Structure 1
Amino acid sequence: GSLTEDGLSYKEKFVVRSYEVGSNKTATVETIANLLQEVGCNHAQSVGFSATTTTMRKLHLIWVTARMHIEIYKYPAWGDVVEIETWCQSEGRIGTRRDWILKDSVTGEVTGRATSKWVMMNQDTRRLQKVSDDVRDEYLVFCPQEPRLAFPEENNRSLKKIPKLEDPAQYSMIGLKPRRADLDMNQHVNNVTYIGWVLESIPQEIVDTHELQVITLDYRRECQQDDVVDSLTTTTSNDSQFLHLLRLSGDGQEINRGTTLWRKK
């Protein structure tokens, strides 16, 4: 729970809780996602945000997720101490980037890593806008000046166009609804719930024999508190790959589209 020596990144340690683990006695993908969100919120708070800046609050602007990419090598067990390091970076006028590094506190080894793309949006009109110079200045003094990427790769999985799932979907999970636990302090559906909804259409047999290694997820539209989501999946592929689609049950309005990679246990 502290900024690093240069104040250009934040570090936090977590002990994995009993209710945070799944069938394999290891932290669920949603627990990891929540832990990334927690270390990110505290980083924004430790430098004077609320993650809006002074100019963003004046112009009724907020940061919204556009893409999420998480890769796990080892899921921490119940009781294990995991340490996460996060940092923000500017992507010119497209928006901002937030990266994460997951580590084992005992061995120091990197057991996972994440990256997210954030676009600026007017709170009310919901219209995405390009980042102005005045706002870009207010967050550049908290970002590393040299590019520091959790996924440095010359042609990585985090920056690839995701196709649209064509009907009929191989697998599906219908009538998914958020509850009050899924909503945040601003009554909006938590970004992590969409990850959990995406994986609900993965069959229970794949979950019992494989471990989720990678998950890329695009956030096309928000699901309202009183909305109902349909989760769709199709095997595309020792490794399994799937195409995903979250859409509103009625009109079929797309809210999310993603991909997952799984490996044998």
Structure 2
Amino acid sequence: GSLTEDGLSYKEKFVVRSYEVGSNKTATVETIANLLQEVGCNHAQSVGFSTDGFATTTTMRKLHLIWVTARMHIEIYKYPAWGDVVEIETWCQSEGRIGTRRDWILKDSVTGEVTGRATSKWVMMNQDTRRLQKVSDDVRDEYLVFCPQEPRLAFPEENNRSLKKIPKLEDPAQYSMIGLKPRRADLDMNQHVNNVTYIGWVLESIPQEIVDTHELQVITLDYRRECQQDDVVDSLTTTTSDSQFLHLLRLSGDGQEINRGTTLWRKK
């Protein structure tokens, strides 16, 4: 992997592994989401950020602030097969004082054709109190030298699928998968549940017949609250229609919301 010539974006190639593919012998959306995280981490390291915190500037570390994912939006036109080489380019951009955005473009390394794209919204949070906040001018100025100055968007379209509000699923859900718990492989180096695990949990309540006859084209996921290592989750899905679904992840007991999302599936 390497920064591009202008030092404003980062590219990395990956050869798809045997255990990374699903029933169609192509990479799962969870494998794609893990590769997006990996290239995002390698971009932060190449531009000088320490490994003891993801993209935390010097001021962020003194104020005990971290970046947290508020929303993830992924669109896949073609999933890479086992043995295929996918190239991923990633970049960041400041969004005033709301937060930061990280975008990605996926290409088939052999043909150079765009096979997917993703975008994500990140907010500042105090790691101890878990209190969200707007981005300080002091902090914002420290990371602007690593971002393109003119807007560069993976989803240019004015008011598209990546920027639409998500409604709350109403009981009763059409489908559900209950009692989902993270295991040690679902945790990161800081013992927090990996963001990709929540994508897997959302998808668990999609019926197998949809998965067997359709391919996932779009997924938008909002992150409201973390699942702890000792928490239990329920995954809820209702068809809102190509098939479209509304999703809700909530704590098994009191029903506290952890995520809400939408998926769009194309007939194979």
- TM interval, shorter chain, is over 0.9
1:223 to partner: Cα distance: 0.3
1:138 to partner: Cα distance: 1.1
3-state DSSP of counterpart to 2:211: helix
Residue deviations 1:17-38 (CA, integer Å, cap 9, x gap): 0000000000001000000000
Q: Which moved more, 1:188-197 or 1:46-55?
A: 46-55
1:118 and 1:49 map into 2 onto residues whose CA distance is: 17
2:248 and 2:21 map into 1 onto residues whose CA distance is: 26
1:49 to partner: Cα distance: 1.5
Residue deviations 1:232-253 (CA, integer Å, cap 9, x gap): 000000x000000000000000
1:95 to partner: Cα distance: 0.4
Residue deviations 1:96-117 (CA, integer Å, cap 9, x gap): 0000000000010000000000
1:155 to partner: Cα distance: 2.3
Residue deviations 1:150-189 (CA, integer Å, cap 9, x gap): 0001221000000000000000000000011110011100
2:224 and 2:158 map into 1 onto residues whose CA distance is: 26
* Structure 1 residue runs without a partner (length 5+): none
Residue deviations 1:51-79 (CA, integer Å, cap 9, x gap): 21110000000000000000000000000
Match of 1:158 in 2: 162
1:101 and 1:172 map into 2 onto residues whose CA distance is: 32
1:256 and 1:88 map into 2 onto residues whose CA distance is: 24
Match of 1:9 in 2: 9
Residue deviations 1:116-175 (CA, integer Å, cap 9, x gap): 000000000000011001110111000000000000012210000000000000000000
Match of 2:255 in 1: 252
The answer as to 2:190 corresponding to 1:189 is no
1:48 to partner: Cα distance: 1.4
3-state DSSP of counterpart to 2:146: coil
Match of 1:57 in 2: 61
1:190 and 1:154 map into 2 onto residues whose CA distance is: 31
Q: Normalization by structure 2: what TM-score?
A: 0.98
1:155 and 1:161 map into 2 onto residues whose CA distance is: 11
Match of 1:91 in 2: 95
1:227 and 1:72 map into 2 onto residues whose CA distance is: 31
Q: Normalization by structure 1: what TM-score?
A: 0.99
Q: Which moved more, 1:139-148 or 1:41-50?
A: 41-50
The answer as to 2:23 corresponding to 1:23 is yes
* Structure 2 residue runs without a partner (length 5+): none
